[PDB]
Design a protein around this ligand. Structure first.
Ligand SMILES: Nc1ccn([C@@H]2O[C@H](CO)[C@@H](O)[C@H]2O)c(=O)n1
Ligand SMILES: Nc1ccn([C@@H]2O[C@H](CO)[C@@H](O)[C@H]2O)c(=O)n1
Ligand SMILES: Nc1ccn([C@@H]2O[C@H](CO)[C@@H](O)[C@H]2O)c(=O)n1
Ligand SMILES: Nc1ccn([C@@H]2O[C@H](CO)[C@@H](O)[C@H]2O)c(=O)n1
Ligand SMILES: Nc1ccn([C@@H]2O[C@H](CO)[C@@H](O)[C@H]2O)c(=O)n1
Ligand SMILES: Nc1ccn([C@@H]2O[C@H](CO)[C@@H](O)[C@H]2O)c(=O)n1
Lengths: 157, 157, 157, 157, 157, 157
């Protein structure tokens, strides 16, 4: 079984983000076509250790920001597949940027939406960058070695 | 006097977005380095001239979506400069994607924030993709012939 | 009145190609949004000014080929708009490659088909790379300052 | 033995295409550096099942075309190597486009020509996009882990 | 008379670099196809207006470096043509990187070599990235509206 | 243990280059995350055999140069990681070009500097293209499966 690495695109601000985060991570743990160990998970890759939760003064530090921004781009460009954990009611400008970067870097762009949310409207441009969008319950068995193009069965605005 | 064209990146989904939209458009009309006539305004380039909020029968039309998505990419790639009307409290996933696309197309990426909001934290990834960020009241006089890189006078989250 | 430059993508290997070539060139001469003088015409930019059909000693010259190939890429990348004079029944692999290159360089990709052939099926991949396709008789009046995406009024095979 | 995946670029219209198709497929089956299972073969990836042979009404469907076009680009961008089964007498605009896309996506671009045809003239731009061109009989033993640049020993037009 | 802008690629780290710098700048002032006013000159675009050789406190400032690096990339991407003032005996790693970046941004890459040095061997990779190379005394009259590919009249090492 | 391939970017002119070359090669031989066998080493990939050491007439041959230039680009684009063996006192325009190419091709760009030299000033643009710069003694244990962004702890000019 060949395995692909992913960039774990996902917010961690809100309760719905955190729930979807935990679920997507569990699905990837079960997916035999994913090498999670060698995948890039932003939350586990805080520059120089420094946790911004505990030291918010770093949010005005240009060096911290440059390094964190660059680490994210690096994580996208050096991994096989771009994953976007996507909450239709809580769409994220940062994830959006990353989707557009991933597109430019020639990566497959997979959005994953919670089953309870699948079908709800998403932004045209999110709809368009995506090569495919699936429900959370399909993530554990998605074949990342044979990724295909498909359309969201759902609304755009 | 050389003139550049822009892509008008902006949400139109809240009252603060719409207010910023109207102000930015007025500033561009007054800027002697911008050719607004030959610029791309997404809201005037929707497929078949139809907005999905005014004709919700198009919410699941895949042809309308494909064409509108593609028209936007074309608007970014064929114009000189990428503009992002940006509300820190109401950031737009669609604009984010477009910032990433613009970066891929080698365009200058200028964010413009209402004066009342300038200085407030913005998303890391918006901070990073952007080449520069200014107050709404600076847009009318910005020299688009000599565009330069600068850091936002403001924090990220 | 702003003017754009074009790369003149066109075969010259059949009578219908050559007829379309001559017509497209005449239309461009009359289009007030085109600067034809500073446009790239492949047939005037062959290495050492020599065409391989008139001097078949060059059929295996690797230097002539490298230079002519590279001159074409340079012609696409340094001009505003990619034009493809396109015969549905006599499609050209060389033009196809160039359509792909132009896409990579972020150029508007306009196919122009003789009126007598407009509406006939074209290759899927030509249909997709193209931003738009028009009849020969529309080329003289096309506004290259406001280029937009549209679907071919026609089938694919 | 590391293995690479390919996109199987090849027409299936004519008798010469079909013969070369069958031969190239057999060679890849024998090549220990190719993972054919996880490679993208357009003919086995018809969108939503729908075979256009049996339902030609889909050739005027914009959604079918968008999806099929995108599936092909996706198959090129997500695989390691671009293969072009190339018939000098029957050159294909669609394959051409794909070669240019593959180039832009940073892939090795390998043309394979039937032994009976190797040496016959090919288009300059096909000659140029290619990183290498080989005879059909060399495909089964080509080392895809150590791909090199070389010139076609043959004519261009 | 159409005018193009340039990025002024040049070292300033030896006497021969500086002499070539001054000569190239004078030639550009006289070239009727160049808009020098709206061109990017790296030495006038250092972050905070400070040169590290005049203020060595900035030798380890990561913010100064990030901004100056980014300003240069922006200068290449937003101007029409990439110029490289090139000393065969004193080749510059920084300019080299920029040649590669310019290639990525689809810009014409023109090297200009002092007359006294024109014809001397240059690095293979400089020879290859360049679209063309000329003598300093040709820069004042070069037609930047019709830029073409040519091989250096000179060797590589 | 997954393994990545590299392009071995390094000069071989001077005594310091040759020493660093030998050391970097030995470190890669010891690194379990590198597949050196399938990596691209320019010095072992002389076109058509022809060694330029022994036949310097090839330095004025345009075909030799085209092929060697292209083989290098091909070696960068088809491998996972770009390595630059970097001597601060002897910076190389060719390596510079390759770094910029690698960046454009979405590769991780790792500079490696001799321990005796680590901390010495390097060009701004080398500092910027790099995703990371390490000392020679860290190369044997660098985890190429989890590459990260970091800043040189050293001077720029
Ligand atoms: N402080 C921050 C803010 C944003 N991010 C990146 O941006 C996405 C969420 O906006 C996430 O996918 C994440 O990669 C980050 O890493 N750190
Ligand atoms: N229905 C829609 C939705 C989005 N957009 C594009 O995306 C941004 C707004 O999210 C805008 O910047 C716009 O380009 C659009 O054009 N039409
Ligand atoms: N001998 C040749 C052959 C091809 N071409 C380029 O490719 C297209 C014609 O196939 C044309 O669009 C042209 O750019 C060329 O320039 N010279
Ligand atoms: N109806 C069609 C037409 C074309 N193609 C793609 O284009 C190439 C042949 O033109 C082939 O390589 C194939 O990928 C396709 O998939 N379906
Ligand atoms: N301190 C520095 C060092 C380098 N540069 C850029 O890189 C080239 C000179 O190496 C120049 O072409 C210039 O663009 C710079 O701008 N500032
Ligand atoms: N004659 C030459 C000259 C240069 N090179 C490539 O350029 C880098 C050193 O300049 C090296 O990294 C090497 O790839 C080459 O291969 N052959």
């Amino acid at each position: 079984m060949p395995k692909k690495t992913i960039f774990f695109g996902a917010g961690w601000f809100t309760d719905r983000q955190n729930k979807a985060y935990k679920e997507a991570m569990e699905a990837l743990k079960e997916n035999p076509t994913i090498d999670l160990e060698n995948s890039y998970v932003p939350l586990d890759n805080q520059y120089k250790g420094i946790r911004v939760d505990e030291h918010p003064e770093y949010l005005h530090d240009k060096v911290w920001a440059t390094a964190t921004y660059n680490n994210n781009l690096n994580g996208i460009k050096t991994n096989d597949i771009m994953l976007g954990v996507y909450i239709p009611d809580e769409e994220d400008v940062g994830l959006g940027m990353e989707l557009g970067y991933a597109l430019s870097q020639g990566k497959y762009v997979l959005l994953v939406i919670p089953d309870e949310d699948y079908g709800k409207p998403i932004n045209l441009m999110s709809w368009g960058v995506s090569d495919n969008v699936i429900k959370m319950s399909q993530l554990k068995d998605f074949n990342f070695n044979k990724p295909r193009f498909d359309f969201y069965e759902g609304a755009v605005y």
